[PDB]
Design an enzyme around this catalytic site. Sequence first.
Site: not given
Ligand SMILES: C[C@@H](c1ccc(F)cc1)N1C(=O)C(C)(C)c2cnc(Nc3cccnc3)nc21
Length: 296
Positions: A12, A14-16, A18-19, A35, A128
């Site tokens: 869902i 990817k990045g620096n 951390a994914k 995470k 922030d």
């Molecule tokens: C991947 C990331 C995240 C967090 C905030 C954002 F605004 C965008 C991505 N992210 C996280 O780090 C954690 C908390 C584990 C997390 C949990 N649930 C989701 N759900 C999601 C995001 C986008 C699209 N569909 C679903 N993203 C998460």
Amino acid sequence: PHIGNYRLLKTIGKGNFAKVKLARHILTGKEVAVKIIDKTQLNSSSLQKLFREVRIMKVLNHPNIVKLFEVIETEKTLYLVMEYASGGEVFDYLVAHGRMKEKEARAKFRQIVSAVQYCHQKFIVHRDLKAENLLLDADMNIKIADFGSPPYAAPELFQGKDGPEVDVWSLGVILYTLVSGSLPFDNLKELRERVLRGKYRIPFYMSTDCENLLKKFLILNPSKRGTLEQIMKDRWMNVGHEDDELKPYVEPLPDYKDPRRTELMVSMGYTREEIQDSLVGQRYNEVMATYLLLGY
Ligand SMILES: C[C@@H](c1ccc(F)cc1)N1C(=O)C(C)(C)c2cnc(Nc3cccnc3)nc21
């Protein structure tokens, strides 16, 4: 696609180094978001900030802040198992839906304010807050992501001056962002001036009600900005919530001895004592994870 007690599915994000990968808790069949952080590649300051996040995530228990279930630590890699927010980014929603009608914005904002204030009860300041730091669950409820940007900064943050007063400014920005679809202030200097002036563009469709609340948040003097507890009693905050006025977050009492979950866990080979010690000790181990997830 098998990191500990979890089976990895999609990616869902990817990045620096951390994914974030969507996964499933094998013992409970529950959906989570893992995470995965590679500490070998993390610099001096970011590791300090990472350990701050893990330490904060552990104390919080609000229905609008992403829950942490397990912390899987290795020398080089750190795995943080959190609740997956199915709805997605509030940013993509504001992009697609256009903007939010005050009625919809109110529902999501009540939660944002409740969640942020709950951190404040515990003397924790996000420092922030952003619309791309805000998530949505299955039932379109706010889920504040993590503690891991400039239009959201307070005046004194430019003026060279860090407490809860800062988060009150950011919420004003967030509220405006939700109802209008845009940022209240906009290179540097141009943003520095417009934020310092305080004057933001009031959209034609905005209510007198909503503008008053914005005035409660967006105040130049950090010393003259209201508390989140006094802002909770604002009229706009309680429109259609007359009997149920917004109050500082409840915080439920600990149920560390649920019989339903403990019988299922003792059946899994877990000792009743290790189930209790892990929760009292708030260890966020495989025992604690299994228990919290079983309660869904
Ligand atoms: C991947 C990331 C995240 C967090 C905030 C954002 F605004 C965008 C991505 N992210 C996280 O780090 C954690 C908390 C584990 C997390 C949990 N649930 C989701 N759900 C999601 C995001 C986008 C699209 N569909 C679903 N993203 C998460």
